[PDB]
Amino acid sequence: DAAPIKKVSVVIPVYNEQESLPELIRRTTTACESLGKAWEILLIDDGSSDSSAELMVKASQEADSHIISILLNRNYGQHAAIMAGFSHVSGDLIITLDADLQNPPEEIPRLVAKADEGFDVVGTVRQNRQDSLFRKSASKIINLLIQRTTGKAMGDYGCMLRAYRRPIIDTMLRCHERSTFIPILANIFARRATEIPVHHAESFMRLINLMYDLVTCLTTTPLRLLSLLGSVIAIGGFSLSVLLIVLRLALGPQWAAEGVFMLFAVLFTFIGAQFIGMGLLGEYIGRIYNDVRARPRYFVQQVIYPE
Amino acid sequence: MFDAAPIKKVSVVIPVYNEQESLPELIRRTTTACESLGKAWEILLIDDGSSDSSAELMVKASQEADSHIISILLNRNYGQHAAIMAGFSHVSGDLIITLDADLQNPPEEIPRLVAKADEGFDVVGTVRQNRQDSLFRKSASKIINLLIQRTTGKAMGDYGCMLRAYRRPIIDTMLRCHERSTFIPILANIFARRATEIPVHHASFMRLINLMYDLVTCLTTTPLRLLSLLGSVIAIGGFSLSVLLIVLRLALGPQWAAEGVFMLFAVLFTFIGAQFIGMGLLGEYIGRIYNDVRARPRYFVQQVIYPE
Amino acid sequence: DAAPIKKVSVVIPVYNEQESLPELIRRTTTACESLGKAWEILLIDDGSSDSSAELMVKASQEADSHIISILLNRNYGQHAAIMAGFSHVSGDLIITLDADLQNPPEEIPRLVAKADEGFDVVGTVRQNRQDSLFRKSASKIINLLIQRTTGKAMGDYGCMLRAYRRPIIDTMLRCHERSTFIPILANIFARRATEIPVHHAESFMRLINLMYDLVTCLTTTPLRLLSLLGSVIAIGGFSLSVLLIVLRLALGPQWAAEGVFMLFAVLFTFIGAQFIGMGLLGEYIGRIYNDVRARPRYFVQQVIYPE
Amino acid sequence: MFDAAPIKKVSVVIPVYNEQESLPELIRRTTTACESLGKAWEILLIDDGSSDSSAELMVKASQEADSHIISILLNRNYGQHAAIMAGFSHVSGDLIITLDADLQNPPEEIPRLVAKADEGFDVVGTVRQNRQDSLFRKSASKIINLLIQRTTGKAMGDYGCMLRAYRRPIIDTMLRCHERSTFIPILANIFARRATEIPVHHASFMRLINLMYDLVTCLTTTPLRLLSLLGSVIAIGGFSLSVLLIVLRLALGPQWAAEGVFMLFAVLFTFIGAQFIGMGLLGEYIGRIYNDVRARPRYFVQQVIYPE
């Protein structure tokens, strides 16, 4: 059971897209007109160096237009532009769309219908996605990680053609997390989420940076793993210490030498102590990071009090 | 302080996760025990996003005529702690009993807790007897008991079983704590005036390390303090020895093996001590931050008397 | 310029003082009556095991009495009892007093007069304090640390006979800091603070714990010192590494040996790297700790706009 | 984006701390420069808890007939940054100029900044020419310039002098940042659209380390990331070498010196790598916490156009 959707706000972050902006505006206008609802398109200029801002202003200033141009003084990123657009939306359902026509605007009605069934978040999965197998492995491993963390299974993450209900946008704006990935945050705050299949027209350090960013946004489990591996390495260090100095010194004084072995067996327990301390610091940092975000402890779905 | 309020209603909180195999037997036994109590009772079954037909059984049990069962369905799995907290958020009785859903703790022990809660105890835990296990696990349980005794003061031995009784003020105070992934019995013992235990008869190493890491955050906010002391002596000797071998002895003190090797030893130990002191300072500041962010309530006011 | 003081609330944390409550209540009642203002005494029972709670209740239930008894279900500490009392005060000026008659209640009027001059906080310094010289060393070093940190010079800290204005109490209750020492917090939030001299009737691990607690509450300077000393130790480690293996290897191969010197000069640079990393973590932790507390950046005392 | 607003009022912010020796000359020179500007002007003198008679001089200057001086007195010392922020909280002009109170930067350079701010620059910094110092200090200044160029993008060379010009929107955005003990020019460059510098002619190693530690928090939130990579290689080799010396070679591979010594060597670098990776993970989580707690504004909206 969900409130009926009366207005759709399309948020499009624009950055140096002067050659695609007219076609995007025309296609998005046609798609939104083919809805039978109040609609508006929020174009956000992320400090474009080209004539994108002039085209946005001309589109906004046209006769009987539904386009809102939000100009940022400089470049801030897709996330900051999308949140700036979220801060100015007025519709019941907010659709995030690519500005480079990778995701066709004609898929917009299909999302809206799916949002009418009572889904807070309606993601899209791109069919027949052709790319390197390494990115495919990354896609499946991040899918499994998000499924185990947030519960709601999310497939394609690079496609930001998504639908959110207004309460989800309001919660995300009022949330204590700032740099977190918006689809992940929506899945975290979603009551009911789903996905639909869509058809898409078209380094290595960046991939590792994205992996670290997503793992840190989702869970603190890696901190617990660090603590556990630190405990294990510390136990190994104490075992090597007792084995090397205490036993082999009693067995062979000359064999275990005078210089190198014994006091560095003593060194090995100090590295174990350092690992245990770092694990305790990690535990406390994880608790702090969980508490500051103040994500909901649970969502009750239905309570069935008897007669 | 002013004695204890009489117990009029008992709320049983049972977190359920994929327990369709034993759910009917659990419901029947818990209903029989609560009917034998002789007070108003209710059973809060919480579905923690079960994949099986547990939710359907809970709905059928709640919808049955003249039933005292409340079904709380969660959209997905959040864990036993989150399900128990969700159940706490919906209780209405004076005494709240947490019970296992896998029939490890027999529901027929419920009256014995309630009678103990009638003596004026805020928390009534259970300790399992005839528990056969490794002596190592028993030693671990005993040392955890001793640590919690030293920390919270209240006498509370066994934490393996979650069959426990809390008074409504303790539950209300715990609900005001927005800590995520805490340990419920420790939090109860923090705000409890008089806690006790009763004996019950029930039917790896990485786990112990995980439990120790979980409990250490709940018990104290600054373990690394001790490490700083352990660092300081390693620094002081690491300095006191170092100069003593050269600053006193240049040409008279090459000694039998090597003075340079023992300088490597001493300066390395001094660096180890400095590293320990740094970790202690980091821990101090992190503990302060954690205590401020946790925002746990500082006290529980029992009664305020205003003059006429 | 300050608002006039019309009501005085005395907050007295009580813990196992059943032999002191009658005399303390009588003397505090006489002192508060000798004021010509509305007064009230908040006695807080910190889970006393003796008959203290019964005496507090009898005092509160007497004819035309001004005593409020706040009973805590168990022991929580002097700080928690004082904050519980602060949560229930109603007067303009709040006076914290010892329950064991160490600070005579007859000093209460002298504080109130000093609070009438327009001071937010009026502390007391104990004269002719006879004790071990080591406590004197601790007293002066903590005085200098508090003076350099909070600006307002504060002497005796063990004497909690203090006066606070109601806005200071409200700010302390609404503050984000929880376990901080109350006189230090009052000096931090005070606009104008002062001290008056008073006459008082009468291990080692605890002292170092209190030193660590006060240093951590006041400043993050020790974190910067840790970073600086870590940088210095790291530079020393790199210097020792280059000196011991790189140079002495080329000078004497047999003299500098094979096992113990070379590889472990290589160890020394990793020790320095660990120190630098720990210092950088400390810098970020200090920034977090400063930002979460959200202490005021400045207090403007007077603005003198021209004609 | 839509060109730049005209400049109608200039506010000069001067943090004062025990500067009674040069305060009258500074006031006279700044008044002359601002009168020569040809716009509405005001001088905000901020007394940062001076122990000398600086406050009395500022009060006399503010109380003088037909004076454009605003005296803001602070009860105690809070630092130059807090005094400058307090001055920012009271400005009313379109362009805000921060100026040294010790006459290191001549006030006669004020018009040259304003004219540059008339070309449409949000931030107009100053770089000092004919600056004679150690080549080491010059290299430090240049590498800091390069790091800030790579981080914030805006071209901003010299940060030693605080003689700078900011547009009112930049000051307003900076006031919405509740960060404590940040670096003001870096924060301005973060929100600035077009920043520039002009040349001016002005009249230890622990310091450099302190400045680097101060700037590293403002520039990035996760330096330790790189250390984690440096750890990972030390781990992988620390593993790859270790087994290769024994798991391949038991009796054929004692080798010339010692296989056990090289085992201690290899497992030691394995532990060092693990420690680096742990410090990297701690840094990642601490950086996330710091970024969330800082709550810096994510963007500055320049104009919103609504359709008719």
Which properties best describe this structure?
seven-stranded mixed β-sheet, membrane protein, homotetramer, Spore Coat Polysaccharide Biosynthesis Protein SpsA, Chain A, 307 residues, Center for Structural Biology of Infectious Diseases, glycolipid biosynthesis, transferase, Structural Genomics
The CATH superfamily of the largest domain in chain A is identified as Spore Coat Polysaccharide Biosynthesis Protein SpsA, Chain A
**Looking at the chains present, what oligomeric state does this protein adopt?**
homotetramer
Query: What is the CATH topology assignment of the largest domain in chain A?
Result: Spore Coat Polysaccharide Biosynthesis Protein SpsA, Chain A
Order of helices and strands of chain A: EHEHEHEHEHEHHEHHHE
Structural class by secondary-structure content of chain A: alpha/beta
Strand-residue fraction of chain A?
A: 5-15%
Q: Please tell me the CATH architecture of the largest domain in chain A by its name.
A: Alpha-Beta Complex
Helix content of chain A: 40-55%
Largest interface: B-C, 42 and 63 residues
Radius of gyration based on Cα positions of chain A: 27 Å
Individual helix count of chain A: 10
Can you tell me the overall shape of chain A?
elongated
Strand element count of chain A: 8
Biggest sheet of chain A: strands, sense, closure?
7 strands, mixed
Strand order of the largest sheet of chain A: 3-2-1-4-6-5-7
Subcellular location (chains A, C): Cell inner membrane; Cell membrane
Pfam families (chains A, C): Glycos_transf_2 (PF00535)
Protein name (chains A, C): Undecaprenyl-phosphate 4-deoxy-4-formamido-L-arabinose transferase
GO molecular function, one term (chains A, C): phosphotransferase activity, for other substituted phosphate groups
